[PDB]
Design a protein around this ligand. Structure first.
Ligand SMILES: [Mg+2]
Ligand SMILES: [Mg+2]
Ligand SMILES: [Mg+2]
Ligand SMILES: [Mg+2]
Ligand SMILES: [Mg+2]
Ligand SMILES: [Mg+2]
Ligand SMILES: [Mg+2]
Ligand SMILES: [Mg+2]
Ligand SMILES: [Mg+2]
Ligand SMILES: [Mg+2]
Ligand SMILES: [Mg+2]
Ligand SMILES: [Mg+2]
Ligand SMILES: [Mg+2]
Ligand SMILES: [Mg+2]
Ligand SMILES: [Mg+2]
Ligand SMILES: [Mg+2]
Ligand SMILES: [Mg+2]
Ligand SMILES: [Mg+2]
Ligand SMILES: [Mg+2]
Ligand SMILES: [Mg+2]
Ligand SMILES: [Mg+2]
Ligand SMILES: [Mg+2]
Ligand SMILES: [Mg+2]
Ligand SMILES: [Mg+2]
Ligand SMILES: [Mg+2]
Ligand SMILES: [Mg+2]
Ligand SMILES: [Mg+2]
Ligand SMILES: [Mg+2]
Ligand SMILES: [Mg+2]
Ligand SMILES: [Mg+2]
Ligand SMILES: [Mg+2]
Ligand SMILES: [Mg+2]
Lengths: 103, 51
RNA sequence: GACUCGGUGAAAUCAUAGUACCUGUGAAGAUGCAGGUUACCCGCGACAGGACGGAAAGACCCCGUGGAGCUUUACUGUAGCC
RNA sequence: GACAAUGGUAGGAGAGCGUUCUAAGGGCGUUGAAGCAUGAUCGUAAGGACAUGUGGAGCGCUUAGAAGUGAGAAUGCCGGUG
RNA sequence: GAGGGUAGCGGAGAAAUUCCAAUCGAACCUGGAGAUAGCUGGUUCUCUCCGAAAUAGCUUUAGGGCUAGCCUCAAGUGAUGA
RNA sequence: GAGCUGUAAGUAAGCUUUGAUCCAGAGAUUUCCGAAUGGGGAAACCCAGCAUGAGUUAUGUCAUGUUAUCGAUAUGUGAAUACAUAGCAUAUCAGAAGGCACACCCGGAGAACUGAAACAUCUUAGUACCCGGAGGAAGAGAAAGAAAAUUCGAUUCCCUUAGUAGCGGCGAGCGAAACGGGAAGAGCCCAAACCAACAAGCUUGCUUGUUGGGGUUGUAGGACACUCUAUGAGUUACAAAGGACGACAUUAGACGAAUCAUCUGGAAAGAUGAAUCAAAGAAGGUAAUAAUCCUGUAGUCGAAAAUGUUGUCUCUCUUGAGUGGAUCCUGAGUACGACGGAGCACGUGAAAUUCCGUCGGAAUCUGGGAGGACCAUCUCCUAAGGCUAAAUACUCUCUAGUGACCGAUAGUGAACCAGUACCGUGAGGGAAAGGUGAAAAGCACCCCGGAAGGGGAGUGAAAUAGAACCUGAAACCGUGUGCUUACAAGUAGUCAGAGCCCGUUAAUGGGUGAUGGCGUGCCUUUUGUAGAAUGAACCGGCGAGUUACGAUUUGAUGCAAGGUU
């Protein structure tokens, strides 16, 4: 269950196997967004903001369950399990290395 | 023969296995299966209770 | 108003239909059957003899061990009154 | 190889196909499922297939069960179109 | 013209069976209620075998019913049937 | 534990690790109408009084308390009448009213359609409507019982007794009970004699009225006399009532094991191969069909708070056994009877038991009843006063589930901002209407047109998927076409057969038809129909011997003078 400052690797998409960072997560539609993944081009018309708006190329949302958070000490993707040490709960990557990949 | 704290609680995940106490011997599964494997303690009892 | 042209545009009805007349037969009064006779295909304007034309599961008549309203010295009861 | 019998309403008696679901076994499915359209094919009937298009995801076949099981008429009901 | 009253076994009537929310020999709306109907209409897939009656008796019975008569499968008896 | 500001995109300012928004417990706010309650009233409004206070130099205004009716408790006052009572005036109290799912229950009141092949006694049925009162369950209930042998024992409910005994215009039809097998199992408090005060009459007497205490049953218990026992049991639902000391269950949530690679594909969860967990192969989601991608499951933990079960102790409470019965009490206009009537399965009949109405009306332990009238003998039990858990009946909801249950004309009427549009003055009726894709990527731009629409381009695997949107069948209205038709008599075909055009699931081939024979559609209903008898405008969709309980029959299968729950 990823956070807003992670750096992950996809499994199944139009562009699979590519890495990248996460910039938003949308936790009611549970669809996250990664740079450089699945560009969806828009035909915006001339609005009151964009002076004579036109075509562009921006990556848009994909689901959570095509995205797996990879091991920082190994760079192989991994299920993340949780345990708690002292006051809070931290993410072990279940490859015996807990990550620090929040910020 | 009458109970199993483990055999009733192992073999409950595998597809195709039923673990039944010898007094719960119905007739669908015993012809649904193809292979009776019973303990030797209940085998002497099932003739002493069906005959 | 009907009629012709421009505008808009319903309805009851309707088994399928390229739907003639005579004499006869027939559930005894035929656009459909037999035998004749007469008629090329196609529309508009009218007329009302048929299509047992449409409109209402005939009010007339008769049935139901069908209902209602009314009457009386029909039967059984009852509110009141002596 | 014979030998006989086989029109048919009300109604009585047998053998049958198909539709939906479950149980078990065994399969086909993005190299294209169910439905939809078209075809000169197969069975004695109800019906069964097989290619080709359209279709974009869940179906058959054998055995055996249980039923909301089959459409052309009720001045039927509802929605469409004359 | 404005306010008001009388409500179904009831009310109103210069009496006609008139009026009571386009009506009335007893209003409407629910519930008993899928009332009852000896009466009309309707009842859906296929093929083999056999296949009648429209009469008798009695009925508040004559278009209804019950029994005998006439058909049908299943057992028997088996020479009684023409 | 990182984003949020409803359903709801767009904004524009903002909030947020100093812990938001959401999830659970607890508290403050809670305008106005509503039983409406200060008076009115067309519900959501209007008009006030009484004290306090703001305010203006005051009057107008405002603000929070306050005042309905019965009922109870306290004084005031107190007539026609003089003594008191109705009456009257103040102060406290929160008791009531209304609503409910009215589903289930208990009493009051109570029809007809229908069956008998008509109909009045009967039955539909003490059913539906109406009204009253409570509960999470109500009613019943501690023998004036059943029974007939040897008796056993409060009430309720399930199975059999059994469609039997019986009732009935002896017709239609109603229809028990005990014994037996089980479910779940508690029995108790008042009245009276007698005794101790209190008051009264009216005296050391008696009677009467309260207060305690004593006492509550039939193998006859109690009063009164006799003798012997006590800080051990019983309890806050019956038995008298309140409350601190201490284990679980609810109302949020944690953790939670196991995988890769290639191929076709827009995309793999699919195919082929190589691996792994399993107390986890329930279920759903993810661009197709996933045990190992996500949310989960098996198994484990958590609870500041607030309620519910509750175990323990603490408290209240509390004497229980025997004998003598030589006297005294045991529920009065009651039980019963006469008269009309309802209920008991039982229609007044041979009619007990049971309650109501009117009127007469007993005896008391040698009593008093009841054993289907009544009398005799014998067995059983003690009315006219109260209280009571469990077995059992229900779901408008709440929690977790399941389904040979439906998949939009089905399922609730209502998947869709439903009892809404809409019709009715009213009470009340009461519809239609789901689906783009994986993702909004929702067609920038160019062109004709005022726009609507449209052709290109463009996104997308697909726009022949364009927001009337998946799939798109029939009626029906159309477009050029291969054969054919203007001397013809027609339930529209079928069987012969010429000529011209096309070549098949390749078979005694497909379409068209100049001309000859043959011929009055279908269903219901009938002695009979083309019928001028009925029904259908056409095409879709929906739409009619079913189920439970029994009885008798053949077919099947166990066992055999035995079979069976
Ligand atoms: Mg004109
Ligand atoms: Mg004109
Ligand atoms: Mg004639
Ligand atoms: Mg003629
Ligand atoms: Mg004309
Ligand atoms: Mg005329
Ligand atoms: Mg008629
Ligand atoms: Mg025949
Ligand atoms: Mg038959
Ligand atoms: Mg199907
Ligand atoms: Mg039809
Ligand atoms: Mg008509
Ligand atoms: Mg007259
Ligand atoms: Mg008049
Ligand atoms: Mg009816
Ligand atoms: Mg009825
Ligand atoms: Mg024959
Ligand atoms: Mg928003
Ligand atoms: Mg008020
Ligand atoms: Mg003042
Ligand atoms: Mg018990
Ligand atoms: Mg987890
Ligand atoms: Mg997991
Ligand atoms: Mg009497
Ligand atoms: Mg559909
Ligand atoms: Mg709407
Ligand atoms: Mg493209
Ligand atoms: Mg078409
Ligand atoms: Mg002719
Ligand atoms: Mg006939
Ligand atoms: Mg005609
Ligand atoms: Mg007609």
């Amino acid at each position: 269950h990823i956070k807003k400052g992670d750096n992950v690797k996809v499994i199944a998409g139009k562009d699979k196997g590519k890495e990248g960072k996460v910039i938003a997560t949308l936790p009611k539609k549970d669809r996250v967004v990664v740079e450089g993944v699945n560009i969806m081009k828009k035909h915006q018309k001339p609005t009151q903001l964009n002076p004579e708006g036109g075509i562009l190329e921006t990556e848009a949302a994909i689901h959570v369950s095509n995205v797996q958070l990879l091991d920082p000490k190994t760079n192989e993707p991994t299920r993340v399990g949780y345990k708690f040490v002292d006051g809070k709960k931290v993410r072990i990557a279940k490859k015996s290395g807990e990550e620090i990949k929040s910020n | 023969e009458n109970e199993d704290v483990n055999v009733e609680l192992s073999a409950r995940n595998i597809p195709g296995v039923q673990v039944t106490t010898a007094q719960g011997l119905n007739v669908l599964d015993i012809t649904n299966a193809d292979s009776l494997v019973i303990t030797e303690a209940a085998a002497k009892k099932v003739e002493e209770v069906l005959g």
